[PDB]
Design an enzyme around this catalytic site. Structure first.
Site, PDB file in Angstrom:
ATOM      1  N   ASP A  83      56.826  69.914  31.962  1.00 42.82           N
ATOM      2  CA  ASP A  83      56.927  71.290  32.111  1.00 42.82           C
ATOM      3  C   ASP A  83      55.737  71.894  33.161  1.00 42.82           C
ATOM      4  O   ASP A  83      54.774  71.081  33.360  1.00 42.82           O
ATOM      5  CB  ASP A  83      56.608  71.707  30.622  1.00 42.82           C
ATOM      6  CG  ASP A  83      55.304  71.708  30.014  1.00 42.82           C
ATOM      7  OD1 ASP A  83      54.807  72.460  29.652  1.00 42.82           O
ATOM      8  OD2 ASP A  83      54.572  70.299  30.275  1.00 42.82           O
ATOM      9  N   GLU A  91      53.444  70.233  27.125  1.00 41.33           N
ATOM     10  CA  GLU A  91      51.993  70.094  27.088  1.00 41.33           C
ATOM     11  C   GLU A  91      51.048  71.395  27.758  1.00 41.33           C
ATOM     12  O   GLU A  91      50.097  71.719  27.413  1.00 41.33           O
ATOM     13  CB  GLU A  91      51.576  69.011  28.058  1.00 41.33           C
ATOM     14  CG  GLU A  91      51.558  68.950  29.417  1.00 41.33           C
ATOM     15  CD  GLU A  91      50.222  69.495  29.791  1.00 41.33           C
ATOM     16  OE1 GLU A  91      49.020  69.163  29.312  1.00 41.33           O
ATOM     17  OE2 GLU A  91      49.862  70.485  30.436  1.00 41.33           O
TER      18      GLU A  91
HETATM   19 MN   LIG Z   1      48.535  69.163  33.787  1.00 43.95          MN
HETATM   20 MN   LIG Z   2      48.239  72.649  33.763  1.00 46.83          MN
END
Ligand SMILES: [Mn+2]
Ligand SMILES: [Mn+2]
Length: 467
Positions: free
Chosen positions: A87, A150
């Site tokens: 992501d 994340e």
């Molecule tokens: Mn990263």
């Molecule tokens: Mn980042």
């Protein structure tokens, strides 16, 4: 060296695979969230892209609720994990190219995610592939773990680690080099306001600026209702822009004044090297006669947030030689007639800073202004002894090809590493290169990408082949 030459032999495959992955707009979008796309179309698609080339190259994969998954490579008892996220953070205006149409020049590649974290992941990836292509005698298995959330909330690895195998040793190619054996504590919370007449010179109708806690806002917009004469506000606002070296502009529209400020977006781990668009606009509004609530909203900003990168105005200025400064970022700012306003803050701190104590003091201090704290996730500082055989094992690889003797140190990024007990963050970046993470025109150099691959190659070899 043996390794650098080997790698060069793949330069073209790496660029192609990376391109493919850069071309996928894997930015979280909760409006399209579904069981099939927990955090939206983009991240989901980027995950499967990793499954594809994987398969193409013969590696077995395993998925987990389309939020994260692994690639299997090695053979043996132990398993070296390598945590990559796929992501990416949204991209704003002012780009000299299409953030999600990778451009490739003589020297680099331009596109959101080139630096963090698509560039490294793959560099990591080709390390495994190259070894495998060499028909090496694996003595350890390798689990490349790919996450899809994340950069936001950790939905990806939180799920992955409930059911899946915990690697015996692992790193994240997703901070800096040459090793990052420690990371500040990361945290996020909101400062929310309360409601509470006589037709002032100006009434704030809405205010929006900033979208992610982990980014400095580069856009801010305010909708203002002027009472009588407003040529003053325009001229004033245009002077304000000049004085502060900002870009922006104003339009009266339906009898309403739209004030806009561009800033400079930068990773939240360090806001001092950026220009918070939201905070400046609010600094400007402070010079007006406003409705009581807007006035309170604006005042709050100016009292606690404005020009306070290291939590100074919050009585939280704190520092350590070891893990560094406390940093406070204001990534989200919103206000409206009914509910507003709100400050979203990304605070990071070194081991030793007493977050709760600090946070709780500030909570009482703030009561009198009609504000309150709303804590989000709070993940504690993460430390691994620089000297652990693992770390020295990776560093050796860096030093052999770099010869930079620098010592492994401790940034404030917020990587995957702390998912593993002895989890560490291993490279990507060379002291050599522009850290444009979370910025516009983000790009990675062929040099870095290839030299990173090479080092990942020797490191993973040293570590999973050579006994
Ligand atoms: Mn990263
Ligand atoms: Mn980042």
């Amino acid at each position: 060296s043996m390794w650098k030459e080997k790698v060069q032999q793949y330069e073209d495959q790496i660029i192609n695979d990376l391109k493919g992955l850069l071309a996928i707009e894997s930015v979280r979008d909760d409006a399209k969230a579904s069981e099939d796309a927990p955090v939206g179309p983009g991240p989901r698609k980027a995950l499967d892209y990793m499954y594809e080339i994987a398969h193409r190259d013969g590696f077995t994969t395993h998925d987990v609720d389309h939020i994260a998954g692994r690639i299997e490579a090695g053979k043996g008892n132990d398993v070296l994990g390598i945590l990559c996220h796929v992501d990416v953070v949204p991209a704003g205006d002012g780009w000299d190219s299409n953030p999600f149409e990778p451009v490739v020049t003589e020297d680099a590649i331009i596109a959101r995610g080139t630096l963090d974290d698509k560039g490294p992941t793959i560099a990591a990836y080709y390390a495994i592939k190259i070894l495998e292509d060499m028909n090496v005698d694996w003595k350890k298995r390798i689990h490349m773990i790919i996450g899809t959330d994340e950069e936001s909330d950790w939905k990806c690895t939180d799920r992955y680690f409930k059911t899946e195998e915990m690697p015996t040793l692992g790193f994240a190619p997703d901070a800096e080099f040459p090793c990052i054996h420690g990371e500040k504590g990361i945290t996020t919370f909101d400062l929310v306001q309360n409601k509470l007449q006589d037709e002032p010179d100006y009434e704030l109708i809405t205010f929006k600026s900033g979208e992610r806690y982990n980014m400095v806002p580069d856009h801010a917009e305010a909708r203002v209702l002027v009472k009588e004469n407003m040529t003053d506000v325009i001229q004033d606002f245009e002077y304000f822009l000049e004085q502060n070296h900002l870009q922006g502009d104003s339009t009266v529209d339906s009898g309403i004044l739209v004030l806009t400020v561009e800033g400079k977006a930068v990773h939240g781990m360090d806001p001092s090297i950026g220009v918070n668009a939201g905070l400046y606009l609010l600094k400007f509004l402070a010079s007006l006669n406003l409705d009581n609530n807007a006035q309170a909203f604006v005042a709050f900003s100016n009292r606690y947030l404005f020009n306070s990168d290291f939590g100074e105005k919050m009585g939280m200025k704190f520092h350590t030689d070891v893990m560094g400064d406390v940093t406070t970022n204001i990534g989200v700012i919103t206000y409206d007639n009914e509910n507003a306003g709100l400050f979203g803050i990304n605070l990071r701190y070194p081991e030793g800073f007493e977050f709760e104590k600090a946070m709780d003091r500030f909570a009482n201090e703030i009561q009198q202004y009609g504000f309150e704290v709303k804590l989000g996730k709070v993940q504690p500082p993460h430390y691994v002894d620089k000297n652990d055989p693992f770390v020295q094992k990776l560093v050796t690889a860096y030093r052999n090809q770099t010869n930079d003797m620098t010592e492994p140190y401790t940034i404030g990024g917020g990587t995957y590493a702390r998912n593993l007990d002895k989890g560490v963050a291993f490279g990507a970046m060379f002291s050599d290169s522009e850290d444009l993470m979370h910025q516009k025109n983000e790009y990675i150099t062929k040099k870095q990408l290839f030299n990173a691959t090479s080092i990942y190659l020797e490191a993973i070899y040293s570590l999973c082949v050579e006994e």
